[PDB]
Amino acid sequence: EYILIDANNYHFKSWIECFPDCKVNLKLLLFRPEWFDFFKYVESKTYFPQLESKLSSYLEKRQRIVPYPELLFNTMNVLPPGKIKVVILGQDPYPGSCISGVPYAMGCSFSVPLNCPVPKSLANIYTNLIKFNHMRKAPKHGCLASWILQGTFMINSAFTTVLNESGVHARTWESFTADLIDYLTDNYDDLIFVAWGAHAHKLCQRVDPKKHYIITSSHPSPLSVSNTMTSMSYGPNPKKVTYPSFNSVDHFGKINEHLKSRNKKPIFWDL
Amino acid sequence: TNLSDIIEKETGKQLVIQESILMLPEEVEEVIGNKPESDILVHTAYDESTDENVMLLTSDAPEYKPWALVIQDSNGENKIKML
């Protein structure tokens, strides 16, 4: 109900409606207790001061931060750490809004609220599922709530941006994301990391490649979908390697085949 | 939104930027031919009237200096314009 969002039933508090005192507290936006161990680690670190303060500056200035605060840790409040089966990193959240003014950004990577236009990179995800028979027809909407409930940890590495602006908070969110990723690879075992594009691939370099399964390809954005992607392998001895184009990889099949093999429930992808 | 204004100015299209990615100079080179001096943001819009992806390529935030414009058809063919 925090992940099943609809832009014809959208009255989530704005950032400023959330903190008219421009002092930003992030503690408050995290509801689920299983993330408390992880958070209080991050709270106990150098940057969380700067982070909250850097975020406050934005409010002051006064820039419309997206997603809205109740949506910020959407995926986390829905999914406890021990129940996530797959990590799928986005980079920037969606920058745009519905004509009503409802933002596309909804706290978890690649998803949009119900009755919101579907951005092409998500369309390309649907095309891929259809290609490999995990889906018969593309859904009318782009809300991925169903996947997240089944253990798909879908998060952007930049948790916020500014409405109709891109990339503006990638670096202020950098430390926090590496700490989240470290936390997942250190303290849990058979996770599936999906690296779509160079940057997700870079983040998955911190993943222990013998605890966890990694799927790697180009990013589903229109300019990348059909192209390969080149960087270093994950090993102790990295070689320069080309990874396959997004549309050529059975991502969700590979996810499920692995899950089955470890006696876990596969994820139902169709919508 | 100046970013869609640039797109309008170049193409006559009035469009909504729906998504972005940040690309390393070397990734750019493989798609565009010319190699940028630094990271570029790909600002992606869709135009259903012609069924093409319209992508404006700029420098990183906050400068957003236009560098190139790509118009891509249904088949994935790129028309590349330098800015």
Judge whether A268 lies within some domain.
no
Count of domains observed in chain A: 1
Task: Tell me, yes or no, if A208 is annotated catalytic.
Answer: no
Contact A119 B53 (CB under 8 A): no
Contact list, A226 vs chain B (CB under 8 Å): 76
Q: Can you give the three-state secondary structure of chain A, one letter per residue?
A: CCCCCECCCCCCCCHHHHCCCCCCCCHHHCCCHHHHHHHHHHHCCCHHHHHHHHHHHHHHCCCCEECCHHHCCHHHHHCCHHHCCEEEEECCCCCCECCCCCECCCCCCCCCCECCCCCHHHHHHHHHHHHCCCCCCCCCCCCCHHHHHCCEEEEECCCCEECCCCCCCCCCCHHHHHHHHHHHHHHCCCCEEEEECHHHHHHHHHCCCCCCEEEEECCCCCCCCCCCEEEECCCCCCCEEEECCHHHCCHHHHHHHHHHHCCCCCCCCCC
Task: State the CB neighbour count (10 A cutoff) for residue B79.
Answer: 10
What's the gap in Å between the CA of A95 and the closest CA on chain B?
Answer: 6
Judge whether A77 lies within some domain.
yes
Q: Which residue of A has its CA nearest to B75?
A: A226
- CB proximity list for A143: less than 8 A, separation 6 or greater: A3, A4, A5, A6, A106, A111, A112, A113, A114
> Shortest CB distance from B30 goes to which of A104, A225, A227?
A227
What does the block give as tokens for B33? 């031919």
User: How far is the C-alpha of A202 from the C-alpha of A159, rounded, in Å?
Assistant: 17
Judge whether A4 lies within some domain.
no
Contact B46 A119 (CB under 8 A): yes
Judge whether A8 lies within some domain.
no
As a dihedral over the C-alpha atoms of residue A113, residue A16, residue A97, residue A203, rounded to 10 degrees, the angle is -70
Q: Which of A92, A182, A186, A190 is catalytic?
A: A92
3-class state of residue B39 by DSSP: coil
- In DSSP terms, B80 is beta-bridged to B70
Judge whether A166 lies within some domain.
yes
Judge whether A9 lies within some domain.
no
User: How far is the C-alpha of A124 from the C-alpha of B33, rounded, in Å?
Assistant: 24
Q: Note the maximum CA span of chain B.
A: 34
The boundaries of the domain holding residue A46 are: 16-262
Domains of chain B with CATH codes: 1-83 (3.10.450.20)
Dihedral class, residue B64 (left if φ above 0, else alpha if ψ from -120 to 50, else beta): left
What does the block give as tokens for A189? 């075992």
Task: State the CB neighbour count (10 A cutoff) for residue B73.
Answer: 12
CATH number at residue A174: 3.40.470.10
8 A C-beta contact, residue A238 and residue A215: no
Task: State the CB neighbour count (10 A cutoff) for residue B43.
Answer: 26
Contact A223 B61 (CB under 8 A): no
Nominal resolution in Å? 2.6
Q: What is the DSSP letter of B37?
A: S
